[PDB]
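User: Predict the full complex structure for these chains.
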Amino acid sequence: MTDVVIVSAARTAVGKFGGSLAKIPAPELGAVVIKAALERAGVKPEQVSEVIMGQVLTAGSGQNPARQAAIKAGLPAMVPAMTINKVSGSGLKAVMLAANAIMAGDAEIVVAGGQENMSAAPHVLPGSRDGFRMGDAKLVDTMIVDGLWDVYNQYHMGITAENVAKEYGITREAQDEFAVGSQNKAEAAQKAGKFDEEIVPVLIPQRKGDPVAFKTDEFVRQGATLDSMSGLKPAFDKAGTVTAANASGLNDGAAAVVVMSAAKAKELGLTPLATIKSYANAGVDPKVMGMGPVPASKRALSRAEWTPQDLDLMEINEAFAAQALAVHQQMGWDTSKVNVNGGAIAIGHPIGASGCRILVTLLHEMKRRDAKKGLASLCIGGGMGVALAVERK
Amino acid sequence: MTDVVIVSAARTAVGKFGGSLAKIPAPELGAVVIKAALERAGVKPEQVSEVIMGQVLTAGSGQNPARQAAIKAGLPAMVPAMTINKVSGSGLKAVMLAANAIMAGDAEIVVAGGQENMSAAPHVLPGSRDGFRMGDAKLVDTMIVDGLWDVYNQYHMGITAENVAKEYGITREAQDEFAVGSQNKAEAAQKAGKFDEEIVPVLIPQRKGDPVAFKTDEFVRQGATLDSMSGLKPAFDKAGTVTAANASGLNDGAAAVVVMSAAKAKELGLTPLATIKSYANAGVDPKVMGMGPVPASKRALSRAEWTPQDLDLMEINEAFAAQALAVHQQMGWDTSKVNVNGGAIAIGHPIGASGCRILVTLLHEMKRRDAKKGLASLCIGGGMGVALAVERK
Amino acid sequence: MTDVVIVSAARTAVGKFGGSLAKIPAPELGAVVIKAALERAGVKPEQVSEVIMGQVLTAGSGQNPARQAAIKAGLPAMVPAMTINKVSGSGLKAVMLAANAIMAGDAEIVVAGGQENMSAAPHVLPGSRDGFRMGDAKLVDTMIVDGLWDVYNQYHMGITAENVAKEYGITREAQDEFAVGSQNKAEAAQKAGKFDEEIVPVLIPQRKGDPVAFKTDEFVRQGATLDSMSGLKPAFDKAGTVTAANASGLNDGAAAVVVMSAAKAKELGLTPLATIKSYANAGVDPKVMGMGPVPASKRALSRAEWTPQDLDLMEINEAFAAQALAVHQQMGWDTSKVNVNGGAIAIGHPIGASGCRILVTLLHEMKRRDAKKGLASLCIGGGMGVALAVERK
Amino acid sequence: MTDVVIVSAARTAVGKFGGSLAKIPAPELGAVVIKAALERAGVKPEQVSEVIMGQVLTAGSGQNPARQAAIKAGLPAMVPAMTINKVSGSGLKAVMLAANAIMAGDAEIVVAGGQENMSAAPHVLPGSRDGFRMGDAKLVDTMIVDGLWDVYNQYHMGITAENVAKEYGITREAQDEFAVGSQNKAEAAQKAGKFDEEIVPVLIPQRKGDPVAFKTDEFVRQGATLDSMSGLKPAFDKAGTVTAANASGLNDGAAAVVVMSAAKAKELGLTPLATIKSYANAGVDPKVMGMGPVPASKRALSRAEWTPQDLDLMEINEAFAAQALAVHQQMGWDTSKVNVNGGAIAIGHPIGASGCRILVTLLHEMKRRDAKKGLASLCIGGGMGVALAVERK
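Assistant: Here is the predicted structure of the four-chain assembly.
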């Protein structure tokens, strides 16, 4: 059939919970990256066939957050858009959907990624429409129930990370060591300007002044040490191993890529960043959802006819050190090539955006080191994984 | 390219607002129809490659509503699922994504549809994290803001219907006539048992008694007359034309179809209900979103190399009589072949499910009258349409 | 100092929970009875020195509910008013404060009573001003927390009634005979027109035609039998004696009397309903709050130099059969003189009003029988009692 | 009826909105002053006949806040208590009711005052019991609606201040100058230690450390100048005179006095702080509620047979400089004898407590300077005033 290529890539910086992006709605972050990614590609808004954006947390967001991002980015009304939710998989699954559509001949050019503002997620009042005839009622945190809580077992994602830690023998000390590594890798990449090219600024309005650009991954902890972690108390289970320091955060951000067939890029005179080599999803038991990247990455590698050793660089999302370590244990690949600029423990985890955020990061680093074969993969609440492989000439 | 077929199709009856389905969460509705479509197909749950369900209103619904439906339907954890939101387009867009993934080689068997419980939609409290230092605060109705309110113009979907009525000269009296036709057609279909085959029952628990089977479209008003409608006051604009009787309702329901390649159905010994001939989306100005089906249906017909006159049967969703009538005026096709068993004014409009609900109704009627060429289409809040054409041997 | 007289008495009928008064704010109910009590007394609004109304549930009620009722009853701005809260004692305590003011020469004519709309009580959101940075938050039922919940032991008034039943050996059977007696006596009183004179109609706006006059104690169960109660489940504790049928309900209503010195009444040419003989409060352990009426009634009788046997008629509130029966047990008086027209189990218990409601009922029955000596008393959540004795010449 | 005397007086320091007392519920503030006032007087908890506490904002506070203060202060269950609401009049009115009760013979020893935590007042959800079938709902601020908002005119207390400013010609300049005066007087009293004796410390738990003694009027702004006020935006009306600096604030605190007959204090060997000479209430138009102290103070002076010139010392509450100035203009009294240690503009205005707070301040300063004739008065939302005159031998 047809090869799919990525012609451009952009992300916002990732905001801390209640931080610099907390008052900017997720679609407005999405618009920043859709607009930037098209500019970078040299593609006019009217040439876009569709926009697909992941967003998990949509309570009170208004009709179709992806359409809002597309319109706010300047795209004309003739360009249709769809919002998707595959939890942390969303941002990457959008690119997968774009590739399916191009391959099927349903679309020519697709802007795909994800957008999330966890800070702005509201509380919801279940049963409000009916009323509360007697007795107390509950205001439920949508960020938790819709973003972070397993339906089937009724406990937090952090408990799934405890389950994975026990199953694969991932100790508290190894978690913390992995977490310090991520922070120091991120600090080192940040301090050396390595995130400069991939980040586009978001202008934050200021009461009686000009807006200020936000363009730094403010969640990254500089000068992080093992000692600053090894004393912390477990966050989710009193006898447990997972802490605030060895899990990712609650974060805000967006990321997008522009996708088209290789034949279309050549028709337009565009040199692609990379070819999409393969992609795959996978399902696992919700109890061990952090393991999804294993069967997903294995399926993606098999579709690519690659081995884990053929890879030059990977981005494997760090929702929890416990799960990222188990994944590395089970894949057997070389971890000096994974998250070389740090991961989500340091950078943050805006759930519906991360899938494309890590792809953006992967592509920019590949180019910088002239890596030829890369993979991005993430675990997914409710027991899934997605993985996508890219190849450079 | 690979031909994609639909091998089975099932819907719940549509519940009234606060009616028989009001306490059954949308993913339980989806489960009922996923499970029945697979039974009807003769496809085991472990054969399924992916589930894709639309659901618009997801506040407090828990992680990834489509996964919830899949798991509740008895599908194993290895089967991935994803939720989508293209407003009222969702349930039909789901089927489109399924066909894309089959044609691309990404999936083999997909269960695709939509699910919605508008009755259960809650209120949300924006700003609840920060708190309310002084003064009052708004509890926002998610059904309205997320389902029924245009972002760009900040008014109800009903005003977009008034815009269309004005633009296209659709009178109050023409709307009411249409609406009475739809109710009378739905009444005739009910009395004749036309919906018996497509409807699968939902068992409604009863306090100290056996569950009761809900299996009838309880929103349908039997004995509807013009005099019952022509006296009502307009619902959205005091000088307008759109009333509660010539617009659809707020409703609960779900619908699903099982999709696979023609080669796969042959291998499995399955006789399809139909082949998917073509499909398309479209964008239009949000102010006239009701017109979405015109460019969508023209693109789908074009892709099929059919003309409007080639069609034997259509299902064009009746969000508002005003928009359904403008769509017919612009397409110029034979309206005696449209919504022959009634439409949403009568049956209801569970937004995230409607696009698959109408597909289910189309396919069952096509089979009963031996129609060969069909089309389903819907408008979409924010200014879009989708359309899908099917063909039977 | 002075003899204090009651010149007039009026009450609304008592509304069922969510029933006929549920949409009428408490001060508007209080306005009804203040206006009516003054017309019945022959006292014009500008002669009033003060208005004192009990209201327990005042969340979102607006500034000073008693002043609202006074203004709404047509009293001029020059007449001050005060709201009080002694839980169920409130409505009677108002009368006691009125009589103190008069005896001290602080006031001349006082309208005193209480008003309550339990149906309209809202939920509150504690911590709302600081916000809920992460996690679920509680909407607290003000009816329960402010009206019905013991602060010190953190359980329902119904558990205090279980405590009383156990300590004084009041059995489930005793309680149910008491409760059926109350229903039957109320039904007989309604048939005899006993409440025709005391009740002031409240006009209730209707969907269609003219407002309907609400003027009947609609909570009273006609044709109640022992068999309808002896089989029910306990309402507050598995091992309990207290049920929905042997406790009163959640109710709406108001009541007021007009109070002044005997000398002021003769100077104005008015004939009193009765003279206030004495009154008292008392405190008991919160655990057995239902016994409050014992030390309160003993103190009032002692202040009157009367014996329990001197009484012709008593109104002793029946929040719970369990506590009313223990009160009777400890006082030793003839229970056939008590609540002769039925009590709160049948009529209902609008908490801030009930203390004057029962006095109103007492005074009208005393007149009709030409009884000479009476007493009203109530228990009070948090461990108190109030009692007040009246004499007719 | 003998004279009534005040044997002791105690208050907390006044907290700023969201300040040092913010997390201490009102009845706990109440408890501090009840216990202290009894200790100062030499009265054992079990000798108390009744506790009477003002508290305006009671939404979710639990049953009978006055009783809660009494029990928390260590008074036995046998001591009855009552909460009252006459808005800002509440705390002085409680003393008035205590005096009426002693004169009447009803009580012997009464603890009276008020308590308020405005910081902690929650939001309420009106109609929550019935639910919100469609459309947005409103969370309402109970501080504003129950404490600060005029029922009849539907506007803030600040607007009643603007009414008084216009009607009595009280300029923006005159108001800023008065306000600078109050702040400067309070500053000097803090440096001098004039409040040392009246204030009782409240221990604020620290999380990190031992609990800190809160014992200073932390709202007082030291170094206040005319220049810091004279350019501020009006806070309530655009064409207005009232600002955040010439009005008091939103505050937390409690105060109580112990009251008994002169004969009783002699029997117990107790030296009064003062004799209650007289007291009065009054009503005015809600629109001009700030003038309430005029007729209340004239009525109280009249019952005392005093003239305004007879007074050695006054405490007239400063809700708004606009009304305090109008009150002084109408009474004609010596303003250098009013609020000599500063007033509410500086000290703060915890509404249900302020009427006792100013009395506590009055009594301590009267003793310090050997003043013989004193008076305390405040305005009341909804159009009222209260005044109480005291006399030292």
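The two ends of chain B are 19 Å apart (CA to CA).
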